[PDB]
Design a binder for these strands. Structure first.
Ligand SMILES: Nc1nc2c(ncn2[C@H]2C[C@H](O)[C@@H](COP(=O)(O)CP(=O)(O)OP(=O)(O)O)O2)c(=O)[nH]1
Ligand SMILES: [Mg+2]
Ligand SMILES: [Mg+2]
Ligand code: NA
Ligand code: NA
Length: 326
DNA sequence: CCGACCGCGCATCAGC
DNA sequence: GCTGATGCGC
DNA sequence: GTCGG
């Protein structure tokens, strides 16, 4: 990682605009620029060299100049002194508290972790679990645990039916040696884009993962999506593993390829692929890649039998999971 | 200039 | 109760 | 904040 200083600074700036300014376009601008800079294999030596990058414009470039000259931006160091902004930033780091609730709590005089662990009657279920596992959720998962976690889920799924197919995606499918969480894609033949043949098809999986105590908390559940907590088992007098965010996404089997494409990401990569789908005359979601007419008409689902079928439509040579860590 | 800047599932609230 | 907008997350 | 047209 060649320009950690610059990319860090942009991530700070991005977080501030999102959490404190509630300026979601400025946030996505910083996030893009942080991404392209994070991928560029020269060590940036001036703001001018960095303005040659796309998504880096003038205001970023002058920030990049001030930061190599001094190791800092005073904008950020002011943001770091201001008690109210700092407190907001900090509360967003609890899962389920975003910019709106972070500022509400700070206006209510709730600004630190103690205050939360005392006004829980003001937290909803998600925020409650979030603070409960606050330290754990800040920790990364070494890939070796991801593999450990992978065996449990995939084998517990064949127990409910051997026609379930599960594919870990997220940063694990991109090849990271550490992940924020585990993201799991769920396929069954009896749930095409049409027949809801067997209901509770995703509840089946979840409940079985709860029997064997792999899943231990729930942030949200639905026919298509489960956000919860999981924990690896440990040996005698072996200390416990940290509790981990787990996401499970059930998707029609005949739309699998747009499922993995969505779920391996990254999130920025999907924004750039989907924005480029739009320039080429298509729209892409988790389910389909559709044509557009000059009239805002989301056209008719187009046939894909490979991930690369998606790329060819928008005229992209295939990028391997390792290369979409944008 | 300035319009666009990804697309969706779930929880919760307001309003009726 | 539903519907529609909003927060928050993937 | 940055970009295409
Ligand atoms: N289109 C789109 N896809 C997204 C978005 N956010 C996530 N995804 C897709 C792509 C994303 O890869 C996947 C899971 O998102 P996470 O688990 O939150 C982040 P991951 O990439 O796994 O990295 P980690 O921090 O966990 O190490 O859903 C989004 O905003 N938009
Ligand atoms: Mg992930
Ligand atoms: Mg996830
Ligand atoms: Na530029
Ligand atoms: Na949060």
């Amino acid at each position: 990682t060649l320009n950690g200083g610059i990319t860090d600074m942009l991530t700070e700036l991005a977080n501030f605009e999102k959490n404190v300014s509630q300026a979601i376009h400025k946030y996505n601008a910083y996030r893009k620029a942080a991404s392209v800079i994070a991928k560029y294999p020269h060590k940036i030596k001036s703001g001018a060299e960095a303005k040659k990058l796309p998504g880096v414009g003038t205001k970023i470039a002058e920030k990049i100049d001030e930061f190599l000259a001094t190791g800092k931006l005073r904008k950020l160091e002011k943001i770091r002194q201001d008690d109210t902004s700092s407190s907001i930033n900090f509360l967003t780091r609890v899962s389920g508290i975003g910019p709106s609730a972070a500022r509400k709590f700070v206006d209510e005089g709730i600004k630190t972790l103690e205050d939360l662990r005392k006004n829980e009657d003001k937290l909803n279920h998600h925020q409650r679990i979030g603070l409960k596992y606050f330290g754990d959720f800040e920790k990364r998962i070494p890939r070796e645990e991801m593999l450990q976690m992978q065996d449990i889920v995939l084998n517990e799924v064949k127990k409910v039916d051997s026609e379930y197919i599960a594919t870990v995606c997220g940063s694990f499918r991109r090849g990271a040696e550490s992940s924020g969480d585990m993201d799991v894609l769920l396929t069954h033949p009896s749930f095409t884009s049409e027949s809801t043949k067997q209901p509770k098809l995703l509840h089946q999986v979840v409940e079985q993962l709860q029997k064997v105590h792999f899943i231990t908390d729930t942030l949200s559940k639905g026919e298509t999506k489960f956000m919860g907590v999981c924990q690896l088992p440990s040996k005698n007098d072996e200390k416990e593993y940290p509790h981990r965010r787990i996401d499970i996404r059930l998707i029609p089997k005949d739309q699998y390829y747009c499922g993995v494409l969505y779920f391996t990401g990254s999130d920025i990569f999907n924004k750039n692929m989907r924005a480029h789908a739009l320039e080429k005359g298509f729209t892409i979601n988790e389910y389909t890649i559709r044509p557009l007419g000059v009239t805002g008409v989301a056209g008719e689902p187009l046939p894909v039998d490979s991930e690369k079928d998606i790329f060819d439509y928008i005229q992209w040579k295939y990028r391997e999971p390792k290369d979409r860590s944008e």
